[PDB]
Structure formats: structure tokens, C-alpha cells
Amino acid sequence: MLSERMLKALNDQLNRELYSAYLYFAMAAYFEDLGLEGFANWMKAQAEEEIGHALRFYNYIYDRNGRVELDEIPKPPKEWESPLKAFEAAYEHEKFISKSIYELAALAEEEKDYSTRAFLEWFINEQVEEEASVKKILDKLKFAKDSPQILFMLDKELSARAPKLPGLLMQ
Amino acid sequence: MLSERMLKALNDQLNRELYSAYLYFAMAAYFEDLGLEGFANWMKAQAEEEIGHALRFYNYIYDRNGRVELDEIPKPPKEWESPLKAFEAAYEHEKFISKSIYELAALAEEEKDYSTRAFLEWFINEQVEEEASVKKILDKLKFAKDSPQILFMLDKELSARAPKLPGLLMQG
Amino acid sequence: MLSERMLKALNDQLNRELYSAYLYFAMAAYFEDLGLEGFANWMKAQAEEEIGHALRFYNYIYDRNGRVELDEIPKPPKEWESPLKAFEAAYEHEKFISKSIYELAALAEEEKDYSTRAFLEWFINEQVEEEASVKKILDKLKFAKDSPQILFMLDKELSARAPKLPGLLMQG
Amino acid sequence: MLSERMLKALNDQLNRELYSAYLYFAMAAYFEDLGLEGFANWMKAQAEEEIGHALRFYNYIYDRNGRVELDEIPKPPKEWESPLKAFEAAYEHEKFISKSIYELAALAEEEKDYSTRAFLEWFINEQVEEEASVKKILDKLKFAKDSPQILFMLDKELSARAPKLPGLLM
Amino acid sequence: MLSERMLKALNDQLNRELYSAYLYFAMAAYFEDLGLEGFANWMKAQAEEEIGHALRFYNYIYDRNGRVELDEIPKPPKEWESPLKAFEAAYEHEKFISKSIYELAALAEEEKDYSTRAFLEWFINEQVEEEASVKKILDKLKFAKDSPQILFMLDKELSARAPKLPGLLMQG
Amino acid sequence: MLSERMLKALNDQLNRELYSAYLYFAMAAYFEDLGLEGFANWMKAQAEEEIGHALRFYNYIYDRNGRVELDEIPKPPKEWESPLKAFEAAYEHEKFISKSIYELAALAEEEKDYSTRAFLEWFINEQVEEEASVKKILDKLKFAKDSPQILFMLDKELSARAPKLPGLLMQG
Ligand SMILES: [Ag+]
Ligand SMILES: [Ag+]
Ligand SMILES: [Ag+]
Ligand SMILES: [Ag+]
Ligand SMILES: [Ag+]
Ligand SMILES: [Ag+]
Ligand SMILES: [Ag+]
């Protein structure tokens, strides 16, 4: 049974993963407006993964006989200056998620909660991949400062990643 | 292309659809606490359908040369007195979503926007199926007022419906 | 190689895992007497998992060039007041095993034995599922205290899980 | 119904079959220490067969409307002098189990319990094969007194028999 | 991103893993000279594994926005007194590698670098297999001190493991 | 059997082929830092071929009743000014390897060792492909002087060549 402090910290991170989903959905909207479908689809697919992360906290909380409480999801930013500046904000946010993960692991070790600490190990390993994934595209946008030719080709490469949910629901 | 008023109304329903998902995810949390996994999974699967609806508004807006602006999703209720009262609030919310769809349809007809009127036609037919889906279970919960035996057998029946996203994501 | 104290702690937990199997085989005997074959077969299948847990400690010890010493397995309780009380005792024992896994993890971190700490990681994660598995059925038995109808339906649901060994040995 | 005397006699043999499983799990630990992996796996596979035998007594007791009571399982020996002495102890144990099966068959015929007697027939036939299986390897260990070469080749021969349970759970 | 001390430490282990590969390649040459083709091929297959372990460090460094710097690889021992002594030096080196992995794990915990600590968990679990794999054969060589008959039979048993790279490159 | 002077020259080339692998693994690290994953993967695949060349010398030496002695592998360069200058160094090194192959062939003809001369015939033909493979890409980098657009498109062309070892080793 989780301590009152730990249950709150897991519930807060559940909200953070859900906001991460919403931020990337907001970024998808921004890229769609610029007519960049590849970047937009990539962001929708990334947003779906963040929903999965939230469900993992949901599942673990109930595995430890806890109770999930959903807080509000704040309004995300509407616009960014350039596709480059959107990924810089995406990378800064990924480091924010990792930092909140580290503080969860540090809290679990301080309370001697081995179950939560072992559970968080999935996300520590996961955030390494996601930070590297976002950084890889960020550096390619630094590589094409005043080049619309490369940004066009980047859009085609990222179009390979698409959201998996859309084609499974009603129609 | 869309008027300033129509774009605002479409963006607001996009926000209303995303809240529906979050409200059903809150009900999923409520049923999970009671140890009712069947109801909980049914709600998660329903929440996914609402995200699908929000994506349909997202898609239409950009098809009409508009712009999507995401508003905040408000905090949903944590608890309900009973599973019966939980579905009563869900059916009440389904009528609220249906009502806001009608108001969009009226606004489209008033502005003579035939494209937006034809688009909303899918949701008018969809909401008939969703209202009846929630009402069907509601009546079955009314049918089992002081009977946990039926509530247990109802849980098994709704466990046939499951969320489709969890099994496809990054996994471990 | 392992320290004298660490080897003793791994040998002790190996004995605990074997007793867990023996306790659930005793619970299987309890439920079988009441005619609850589904509960009985669930406990038998659970007992086999605990024997599997014991063999994982066995295998690790010899991977670290240690030696397994088998201690006696004590007599388990014969009877319980109810199917509910039997699962209350099971969940209490599942917290007992989890605690001794934590104490082993703390001992590995104290003796900076990174290999044993990494080995115990499997059991920390495994015990989260085990506790949630037992607690789930415990809550369902609280759900039907004066209801023999649901106890009958719960017995059929647990009969889906069966032991895997019996069909593989000498047949007759 | 089973007689009060017969029920305790079936519960005690159920406990003996569980100790048999625990004794071969102890011998497996001894062979694993010597680096004889084939001997260890053979013993683990034999240990599973004894659990199967214990379940057979479990199933029979409940078929006759009886009640199973589980007693404690005593601590088995940790070490033996040689692989030969380990099998000499195992063969002595198989004769001990066979004898306790005979006394159950003698008790069944005395009380005119034809049901228990007919049930024990499977175990009389099983122990003939069990004793011959252990004795066969024992004689081969006598055949290789001061020969590590043949002990190495015997290890590979017994590695063909492996425990069936481990690969099925989690 | 990695600290200056952590980056240097990860680069060092990358070099240690590459030397391990070069050491087992040197042992392969030693066993090839004695005409023990099974032992030699076992060592070649083990050498490839260590290269893969070096690539796993390489991949992690660039994932954490770091830079890989490749230092020189020292000359390995040419000869050993016996196959028993050759595996004794191998099992000793396995304890050296496991040791340096612990130092990295102790470093990560001191910096609170959870990412590197979580990354190193794979190598801790891997080295348990590695040590047990080498020790198993070492004990079989202790088991056959003055017996060329068992050394011949061991050579055939280890010939089952063969290097995987050769049959994939440019041929002729 | 081989002469002392020939055996040293074969062992020296075996060291050169292993450095060729270590140099290209250093180039792969340089390209990976720039984010050019295709170039990096091309080099890793090329390094594996050099290890394969080294094993051909290893195999031949023992076929002639010789003894392989592994020397130290020196530290390779960390950086290059540009991808263009990186391939200019690679092509210069390829001519260096070919020259040492020519000198080995001249030594075999002078000593009247037909077996080594026949063995080296494979490497004379192999180096023709190797030089032409590097020169082809070098000229294309000369072609993309002030163009990041062509460098991006070259990266994709070379991403088709990938290392074969990583997907066969111990995994997790
Ligand atoms: Ag729908
Ligand atoms: Ag993920
Ligand atoms: Ag398990
Ligand atoms: Ag049998
Ligand atoms: Ag032989
Ligand atoms: Ag080649
Ligand atoms: Ag490995």
C-alpha cells in the first residue's frame, strides 16, 4: 500500500504524461498548419505513446491498491517561431519529464519503496530513447537553417511514423 | 472557407470530445476502484472512441483551410454514489454532447455552410448509437438495484469490450 | 562469489518459496474439501509458480558459484474459517514474502552486491503482480459474504487456471 | 468411507512422496555443486515424478470422501561422499518407499479395503521401474570406481532427462 | 547529458570490452596452436560477443548526446601453460570486467545519473551469465588434470559454438 | 612451412587489417557525432570486412603450420575537418594497405614461397574493389562542395549498407 505522498507523486506524473500527449497533439496542429503532414503524423504517433505511459501509471497505482485521481490538463502553447523552435521546446520538455521521473525514483529510494522504484525503471530506460529520438530530429533542423529543400525531405522521412489508433475506431 | 464564428464552434466541440474521453477515463478509474474491471475496460474503450471523434474535428478543420486551437481540459468528477449513478451522469453527458452537436448543425444551416452541415451528419447518427449504448446499460443497472449477482454478471458481459491502444504502443 | 551471510539469505528465501508452494497446496486441500474445485486448481497452479520461484533462487546460487542447502519445510495450517479468511491469510503471506524480498534487496545494497540486487529485481516486479492477483480475488470474496451464488460463479472463473505438471508425468 | 486408520496411512505416504521429491532435489543440489549438470537434471526430473506421485494420493483421498492433512517435510542430507554413495542412498530410499507401499497394501487387505488396494497397484508397478532405474545407474557408478572419464560420459547420458516444469511457468 | 567524469568512464569500459575481445582472440590463437579447434572456435565466438558489448556502450553514449573516443588496445598475452591455466586467466578477467561494471554503477549512483545506472543493469545481469559460462568449463578442466581423453571430448562439445561473422562477409 | 621473415610479415599485415577495422570504427564514431547515421553504418559494415580480412591471415598462418602473434592496436585519429577529408584519409589508408600487400607479394616471390603468393592473390583483387569503393564516394563528396542537400542524400544512399554482427549477438 502506497504512502499518501507517493500516491500523489504517481498521480501527478500520470497528469504530466497526459499533458505530454496534449502538448504533442498541439505540436501536431502547428505542423499541420504549415502543411507538414509528416511532422504532424509523427507528433500524433508520439502523443499516443504518452497516453500509453499514463495508462502504465494508472495500472500500477491500482496494482498497489491505490486510487487514481485525474487533475485538469492545462492549455498547451498554440504557436512556435519555427519547426526548429518547436523541437527545441519538445526536447526541453522531454528533459522536464525525465527530471520529474528522477525525483520520483529519489523519493522511492528515500521511502524504501522498492516496488515503485522497480516500476520506474521502465520509464528511466524509456526516456533515454525518447530524448535521443527528439534530439536526432532537432539536430537535423539545425542542419537545415535556411533550406526548405531539406525540410521537405525530412517531412517525407517522418511520414513513415503514423498514429495507430485512427484506423481502429468507429469507421 | 470557415467563418470566424464557425471555426470557434468547431474548436470548442473538439475540446468537448476530448473532455468526454477524460470523463470516461475518470469513470474507468471509479469502476477500477470498485474492482469492476469489465465496466472499467468498457469505459477505456469508450474514451478511445471520443479521442477518435476529436481527431475527426481536427481533420475537418484543416480540410477547410482552418486552424486548430486546443483549450484546457477541465478536471472531471472523481467519485459517484453507485455504478447506477455513474451511468446516469454518463447518459446525461451524452445528451449534453448531442445537444451541442444540434447547436453546431443549426449554426451551419444559419450561415448556409453546407460543408460543415454535411460533416456534422456523421456525428448526429453516431450520437444516436452512443446514447442508446449508455441507456441500455443504465436500464440494466436500474434492473439490478439491490442485486450484486447481476452486477457481477454485468461486469463479465462488458469485459468483452476492451481498449485497443494499450497492446500496440511501446512495450515492456 | 557470494558472502557467507548472502548465501544464507538466498538459501532461506529458497526455503520460503518452497513453503509458499506448500501453503498453497494446503489451501488447495482446504478448498477441495468444500467441493470448490476451481479455487483448488487455482491454488495448485499457484503452488507450481512458487516451486518455479524456488528454482530461480537455486539456479542463481550455482551461477554465483555458491551452494544450496535445503532446510526443513514446516507444517502449514490445515483449516480456515471461510474461503474469504483463507484468502486474507494468503494476502497476509504475500506481504510477508514481499517484505523478505525487500530485506534481501536492502542486504544486497548494504553489501554492495550489484549482481544479487539485479537478480532480485525480477522478484520485486513479480511480487507486485502476485499481490494484485490475490487482492483481486480477496475483494471479490468480500463482495459475496452471504451470497453462495457468486461463490459458485467465482469458482467457475478460477477453474480456467489449472496446474501444468500433472499431465506431463507418468500416466495411468 | 475410508477408515480412520487408513486415512492417516494415505496422508503419511503422501508426505513420504513429498520428502522423496525433496530428497532428490537435495541430491540434485549435490551433483550441481560437483559440476555434474546431467546428474543434477536427472534428479530434478525424478523430483517432479515424486510430486506427481504425491498428487495421486491427494486425488485418491478426495475421491473416497476423505481429507488431506499436510505434515512437515523433514530436512534432507546435504552431502554424500561420492556420486556412487549418493545413488546407494537413493537406492536404499527406493527400497524404503517400496516397503511402505507394501505395508499400505497389507493394511488394505486386512481391512478388506479393495478400493485402496486397487489404487496402490499402480504404485507397486511404478516402484519396480523406479528401483530398476536407480540401480542401473548405481551399477554403472560401481563400474567406474576410479574413472572420471566414464563419469564424464555418464553425465552426458543422463542429461537427456530434464525437468519439464521450469519452461512452463512465467 | 553525461558529466565529464561519466563520459570518460563509459569510454574506458568500451575500450575494456574491445580488449576483452582481443584477449579471447589471443586465446583462440593459443588453442589453435595446440590443435584444439573446438576451444579456438568457442573463443572466437566469445570474442564477437565482447565486440557487441562495446557497440552497446557506443550506442548509449550517442543516445546521451556524448562523444566516443577510441583509445589504443594493448598487446594481449601470447601463451599459457595449459588450457586449464588459459581458462583461469579468462575467468580472472571476467571478474575484472564485472568489477569495473560495479565501479561504473557506483559512479552513476553517486552522481544520481539514473539513466546510466539503468543502462548498466543489462551488463550486470549479462556478466553473471558470462562468469558462470567460463567457470563451468574451468571446472571441467580441473576435472581433467592428467586426462587427454576428456580434453578431446571437451573439444568436441565446445565446437558446437562457432563464430557468426565469417560466413557473412565477402567470400572467395 | 613458413620462414621466420615471412611469418613476421604475415602477422604484421594481420595487425594492419585489425587497425583498418579500428580506424573505420573511429571514422564511424566521427560521422555519428555529425548525425550522419548512413555514413556511420557504412563504416561499421566496412570495419567488419577488415576483421574478416584479418581472420583470413589468421587461418592461412595455421594452415602453413605457423603461429599467430597479436601485436598492440595503436590509437586511431579522433577527428577530421570534414566528411570529405575523412574519406581522403580513408583512401590514403587504402593505398597504404595495398602497398603493404604488394610488398608481401614481392617478398613471397623473392623467397620463392608460391603458397603465400597464391594466398595474397585474393587480397590484390580485394583491394581493387576496396579502393574503387572508397574513391567512388570520395569523388561524390568532392561533388557536394558547398551543398548540405547532397550530403543528406548521400547519407541515405549509404544507409543501405549496414553492420551484420549486432543482430546476431546476445540481445536485450
Ligand atoms: Ag465513434
Ligand atoms: Ag513509450
Ligand atoms: Ag511467478
Ligand atoms: Ag512416476
Ligand atoms: Ag569417450
Ligand atoms: Ag573484403
Ligand atoms: Ag553478451
Side-chain angles (χ1 to χ4, degrees):
Chain A
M1 310 200 183
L2 303 155
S3 62
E4 193 198 324
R5 203 164 212 158
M6 184 55 69
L7 181 66
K8 190 184 179 289
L10 290 161
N11 276 303
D12 287 357
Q13 187 58 43
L14 202 155
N15 184 258
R16 285 190 189 94
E17 298 285 354
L18 280 166
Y19 173 78
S20 285
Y22 210 42
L23 175 65
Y24 294 135
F25 190 47
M27 288 189 186
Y30 165 72
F31 280 117
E32 200 85 61
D33 183 38
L34 290 162
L36 297 161
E37 286 188 358
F39 282 82
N41 282 338
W42 194 98
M43 282 297 180
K44 293 173 201 180
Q46 184 60 58
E48 283 182 2
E49 294 284 6
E50 304 297 323
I51 298 164
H53 297 180
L55 286 161
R56 286 178 170 272
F57 279 99
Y58 173 100
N59 291 326
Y60 177 77
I61 285 160
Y62 284 109
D63 279 343
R64 305 300 293 164
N65 203 46
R67 177 72 159 93
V68 166
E69 195 187 318
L70 294 170
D71 303 319
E72 63 137 336
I73 309 159
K75 177 172 182 176
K78 184 194 174 75
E79 279 172 11
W80 289 266
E81 286 185 353
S82 61
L84 171 67
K85 287 281 179 179
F87 267 85
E88 282 182 7
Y91 185 61
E92 192 192 328
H93 183 80
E94 278 292 315
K95 285 198 283 180
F96 168 75
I97 296 301
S98 297
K99 190 173 183 173
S100 56
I101 290 296
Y102 298 142
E103 287 172 8
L104 262 159
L107 184 71
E109 286 166 340
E110 197 165 36
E111 286 187 9
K112 287 178 180 178
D113 195 355
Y114 291 98
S115 296
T116 309
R117 182 60 191 88
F119 156 76
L120 286 158
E121 195 84 339
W122 188 91
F123 291 91
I124 302 166
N125 282 312
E126 166 268 313
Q127 283 295 314
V128 173
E129 272 192 15
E130 280 204 5
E131 275 192 37
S133 182
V134 174
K135 187 70 167 67
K136 188 191 165 183
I137 304 159
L138 197 159
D139 289 328
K140 286 180 177 181
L141 292 164
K142 279 183 173 180
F143 185 67
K145 286 186 179 181
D146 300 313
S147 182
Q149 296 88 38
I150 303 164
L151 183 65
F152 178 80
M153 288 190 287
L154 256 169
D155 190 68
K156 173 137 188 158
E157 281 185 2
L158 297 179
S159 67
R161 194 196 181 184
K164 290 173 182 176
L165 193 69
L168 299 171
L169 303 327
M170 222 149 154
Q171 282 194 27
Chain B
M1 47 194 72
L2 305 161
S3 66
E4 197 209 317
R5 204 182 213 95
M6 185 53 68
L7 185 69
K8 192 182 175 289
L10 287 166
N11 272 297
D12 282 351
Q13 191 62 39
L14 202 159
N15 194 254
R16 281 191 197 93
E17 290 295 342
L18 285 163
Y19 174 75
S20 293
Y22 207 46
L23 173 65
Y24 292 136
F25 189 47
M27 294 186 184
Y30 169 68
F31 288 115
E32 200 83 65
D33 185 57
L34 292 163
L36 296 163
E37 287 186 349
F39 283 86
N41 278 356
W42 194 96
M43 285 292 178
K44 292 168 201 175
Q46 190 56 73
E48 288 181 352
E49 292 287 345
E50 307 294 334
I51 302 164
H53 297 139
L55 279 161
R56 286 180 178 269
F57 280 95
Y58 177 99
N59 290 343
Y60 179 75
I61 287 163
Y62 286 107
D63 280 338
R64 303 302 288 155
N65 202 33
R67 179 65 152 90
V68 166
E69 191 186 321
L70 293 172
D71 301 321
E72 63 141 33
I73 308 159
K75 177 177 179 172
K78 182 197 174 78
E79 283 194 324
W80 285 268
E81 280 190 339
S82 59
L84 172 73
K85 285 282 174 180
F87 263 85
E88 278 179 6
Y91 180 63
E92 192 191 325
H93 181 78
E94 278 294 323
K95 285 194 283 184
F96 166 73
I97 296 299
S98 296
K99 193 174 185 172
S100 59
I101 291 297
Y102 300 145
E103 288 175 5
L104 257 159
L107 188 72
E109 284 168 334
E110 193 172 50
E111 285 185 15
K112 291 177 178 178
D113 195 346
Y114 292 96
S115 290
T116 309
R117 185 54 188 86
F119 160 72
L120 286 154
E121 192 84 338
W122 189 91
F123 288 89
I124 301 157
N125 288 314
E126 169 266 311
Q127 289 297 321
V128 174
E129 211 167 59
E130 279 211 355
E131 274 193 57
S133 187
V134 177
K135 187 71 165 73
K136 183 185 167 177
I137 307 161
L138 196 159
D139 292 324
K140 283 182 177 180
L141 289 164
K142 274 186 176 178
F143 187 73
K145 283 181 181 177
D146 297 319
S147 187
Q149 294 85 18
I150 306 167
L151 187 67
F152 179 77
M153 286 190 290
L154 256 162
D155 195 60
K156 193 198 174 183
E157 285 193 343
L158 302 179
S159 74
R161 199 190 183 187
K164 292 167 187 174
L165 194 69
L168 303 163
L169 272 16
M170 173 205 167
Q171 211 163 326
Chain C
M1 54 150 58
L2 300 158
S3 72
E4 180 206 320
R5 199 197 201 91
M6 183 56 68
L7 182 68
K8 190 183 177 289
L10 294 167
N11 267 307
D12 280 345
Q13 188 62 37
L14 206 156
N15 186 256
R16 286 193 194 94
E17 296 290 351
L18 285 164
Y19 173 75
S20 284
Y22 208 44
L23 178 65
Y24 294 136
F25 188 47
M27 288 188 187
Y30 167 73
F31 285 115
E32 199 87 62
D33 185 57
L34 291 165
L36 298 166
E37 283 189 4
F39 277 83
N41 286 355
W42 191 97
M43 284 297 178
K44 291 175 199 174
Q46 188 51 61
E48 289 181 348
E49 289 284 349
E50 304 296 332
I51 296 162
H53 293 141
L55 280 161
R56 283 182 178 268
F57 274 98
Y58 175 98
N59 288 331
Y60 175 76
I61 288 162
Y62 285 106
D63 284 347
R64 301 301 287 165
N65 204 39
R67 179 72 162 92
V68 165
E69 196 181 325
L70 294 171
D71 301 316
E72 67 139 44
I73 309 159
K75 173 167 186 174
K78 183 195 173 78
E79 286 185 18
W80 289 266
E81 286 189 334
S82 62
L84 171 68
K85 286 284 171 183
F87 265 82
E88 282 180 0
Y91 184 66
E92 194 189 336
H93 180 79
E94 278 296 320
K95 287 190 282 185
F96 168 81
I97 296 298
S98 294
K99 193 172 186 174
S100 58
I101 293 295
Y102 302 143
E103 285 182 3
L104 257 161
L107 185 75
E109 287 165 348
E110 193 164 35
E111 291 184 357
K112 289 161 179 193
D113 192 349
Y114 290 99
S115 293
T116 308
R117 183 57 189 86
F119 160 71
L120 288 157
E121 192 81 338
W122 190 92
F123 286 92
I124 300 162
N125 289 316
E126 165 265 318
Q127 282 295 311
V128 176
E129 282 182 345
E130 283 259 333
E131 279 194 24
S133 177
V134 174
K135 187 72 172 74
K136 185 188 168 180
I137 307 162
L138 193 156
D139 287 324
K140 288 179 179 177
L141 288 162
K142 277 184 173 181
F143 193 76
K145 296 170 180 177
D146 299 332
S147 182
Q149 297 88 29
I150 306 164
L151 183 68
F152 182 88
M153 285 189 285
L154 228 173
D155 187 63
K156 192 195 173 183
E157 284 191 358
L158 297 182
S159 68
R161 194 195 183 187
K164 292 172 182 179
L165 195 62
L168 303 167
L169 305 329
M170 296 169 77
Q171 223 79 294
Chain D
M1 323 275 92
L2 292 163
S3 71
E4 196 191 324
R5 204 167 209 155
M6 185 55 70
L7 183 68
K8 196 185 178 290
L10 292 163
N11 275 304
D12 284 9
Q13 186 56 42
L14 199 156
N15 192 255
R16 288 191 196 100
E17 297 286 355
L18 284 165
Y19 174 75
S20 292
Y22 207 40
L23 178 67
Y24 295 134
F25 189 43
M27 294 191 182
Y30 167 71
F31 286 118
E32 198 85 65
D33 187 43
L34 289 164
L36 296 161
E37 279 195 6
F39 278 83
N41 281 348
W42 192 98
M43 281 292 177
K44 292 172 195 182
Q46 187 56 64
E48 287 176 355
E49 292 291 343
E50 308 295 332
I51 300 164
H53 296 153
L55 287 165
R56 283 179 169 270
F57 275 92
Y58 176 98
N59 291 337
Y60 178 78
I61 288 162
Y62 283 106
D63 278 344
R64 303 298 286 166
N65 207 33
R67 178 74 165 93
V68 164
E69 194 185 341
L70 293 174
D71 302 323
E72 66 142 45
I73 302 162
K75 176 173 182 172
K78 182 201 175 75
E79 285 169 337
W80 292 266
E81 277 191 333
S82 59
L84 172 64
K85 286 285 176 183
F87 263 84
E88 282 180 9
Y91 185 60
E92 191 195 335
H93 182 77
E94 284 292 326
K95 283 193 280 183
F96 165 75
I97 297 298
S98 294
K99 192 171 186 174
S100 56
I101 292 296
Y102 298 148
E103 287 169 12
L104 258 164
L107 189 70
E109 290 161 331
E110 188 183 27
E111 293 185 348
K112 291 170 182 180
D113 192 352
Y114 293 96
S115 292
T116 309
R117 181 60 187 87
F119 159 74
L120 287 154
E121 189 84 332
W122 188 91
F123 286 92
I124 301 163
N125 283 310
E126 160 265 320
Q127 284 286 311
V128 172
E129 218 168 53
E130 271 250 34
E131 278 191 29
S133 183
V134 173
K135 186 69 163 68
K136 183 187 162 180
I137 305 161
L138 191 157
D139 291 344
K140 283 185 176 181
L141 290 160
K142 276 184 176 180
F143 193 75
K145 285 178 182 183
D146 301 312
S147 187
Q149 295 89 34
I150 304 165
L151 188 66
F152 178 79
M153 290 189 288
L154 259 165
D155 190 62
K156 198 194 171 187
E157 280 192 359
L158 299 183
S159 69
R161 195 192 181 185
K164 293 168 182 175
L165 194 67
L168 296 172
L169 12 281
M170 293 184 82
Chain E
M1 39 208 69
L2 307 155
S3 71
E4 196 192 326
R5 191 173 269 116
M6 188 56 64
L7 177 67
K8 190 182 174 291
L10 291 166
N11 267 294
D12 284 359
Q13 188 57 45
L14 203 159
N15 192 248
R16 285 188 194 100
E17 295 284 1
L18 278 165
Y19 173 73
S20 291
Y22 207 42
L23 176 65
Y24 296 131
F25 189 41
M27 292 190 184
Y30 165 71
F31 286 112
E32 202 82 63
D33 184 58
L34 293 163
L36 295 164
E37 285 187 354
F39 280 82
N41 279 344
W42 192 97
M43 283 294 178
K44 290 172 188 180
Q46 189 56 69
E48 292 178 355
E49 280 290 338
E50 311 297 330
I51 298 165
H53 295 212
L55 287 166
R56 284 178 161 274
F57 271 95
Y58 173 100
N59 291 332
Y60 177 75
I61 289 160
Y62 287 110
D63 277 349
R64 301 299 287 166
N65 203 39
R67 180 75 161 91
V68 169
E69 192 187 339
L70 294 164
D71 305 310
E72 64 135 39
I73 304 161
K75 178 180 179 178
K78 184 193 166 74
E79 282 175 331
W80 291 265
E81 291 189 319
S82 59
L84 170 66
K85 285 280 171 186
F87 262 83
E88 276 176 355
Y91 175 69
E92 204 192 330
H93 192 81
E94 279 301 315
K95 284 194 279 186
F96 171 72
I97 297 301
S98 298
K99 146 189 186 152
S100 49
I101 294 294
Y102 300 147
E103 280 168 16
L104 278 154
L107 243 61
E109 288 166 342
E110 193 165 35
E111 265 173 45
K112 291 174 183 178
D113 192 352
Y114 293 102
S115 297
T116 311
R117 186 58 190 85
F119 161 73
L120 286 155
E121 194 80 339
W122 188 91
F123 288 93
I124 297 162
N125 289 304
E126 160 268 316
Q127 284 290 311
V128 178
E129 274 186 5
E130 276 266 311
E131 280 194 46
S133 187
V134 178
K135 187 68 165 69
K136 183 185 170 176
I137 308 161
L138 193 156
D139 290 337
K140 285 179 179 178
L141 292 162
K142 271 185 179 180
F143 193 67
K145 288 179 181 180
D146 301 313
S147 187
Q149 299 92 43
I150 308 166
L151 184 68
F152 184 82
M153 287 187 286
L154 259 166
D155 191 62
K156 198 197 170 188
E157 281 194 355
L158 296 177
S159 66
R161 197 192 182 189
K164 291 170 183 177
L165 196 69
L168 296 170
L169 298 335
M170 182 186 189
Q171 278 270 291
Chain F
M1 41 201 71
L2 298 158
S3 60
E4 189 204 319
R5 204 168 196 166
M6 185 59 64
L7 183 74
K8 194 180 178 288
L10 291 164
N11 269 294
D12 278 345
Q13 191 59 38
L14 206 155
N15 188 256
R16 289 185 192 97
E17 299 286 19
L18 284 163
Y19 175 75
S20 294
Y22 207 47
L23 174 64
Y24 292 143
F25 188 46
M27 290 191 180
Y30 166 68
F31 287 118
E32 201 83 64
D33 183 56
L34 290 163
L36 300 165
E37 284 194 358
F39 282 89
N41 274 342
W42 191 94
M43 283 294 175
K44 292 171 197 176
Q46 186 51 65
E48 291 178 347
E49 290 287 348
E50 302 297 333
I51 300 161
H53 299 151
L55 283 161
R56 287 184 173 270
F57 279 97
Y58 175 106
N59 290 330
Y60 175 76
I61 286 163
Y62 285 106
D63 285 343
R64 303 297 289 162
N65 208 46
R67 180 69 162 92
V68 165
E69 196 177 318
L70 293 167
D71 304 327
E72 65 139 50
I73 304 160
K75 182 179 180 174
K78 183 197 174 79
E79 283 184 321
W80 290 268
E81 284 189 351
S82 62
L84 171 65
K85 286 282 179 182
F87 265 82
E88 281 180 17
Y91 184 59
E92 191 192 330
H93 184 79
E94 280 300 317
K95 289 193 285 177
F96 168 76
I97 293 298
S98 296
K99 195 177 185 174
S100 56
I101 292 297
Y102 298 145
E103 287 175 2
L104 256 160
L107 191 74
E109 289 167 337
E110 193 179 35
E111 284 192 351
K112 289 180 181 178
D113 191 1
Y114 290 106
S115 294
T116 312
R117 184 57 190 85
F119 161 73
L120 288 156
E121 188 85 311
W122 189 94
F123 285 95
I124 302 165
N125 286 315
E126 163 269 327
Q127 284 296 309
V128 176
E129 275 191 23
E130 280 260 350
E131 283 187 46
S133 183
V134 177
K135 185 69 165 67
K136 182 188 167 178
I137 308 166
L138 199 162
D139 294 324
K140 286 184 174 183
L141 287 162
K142 277 183 172 182
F143 196 72
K145 292 197 174 189
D146 291 354
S147 188
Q149 300 87 42
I150 310 166
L151 188 69
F152 182 86
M153 287 192 286
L154 258 162
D155 193 56
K156 194 190 173 181
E157 276 197 2
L158 299 177
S159 68
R161 197 191 183 186
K164 292 170 185 175
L165 194 66
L168 312 165
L169 279 10
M170 228 181 93
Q171 210 183 35

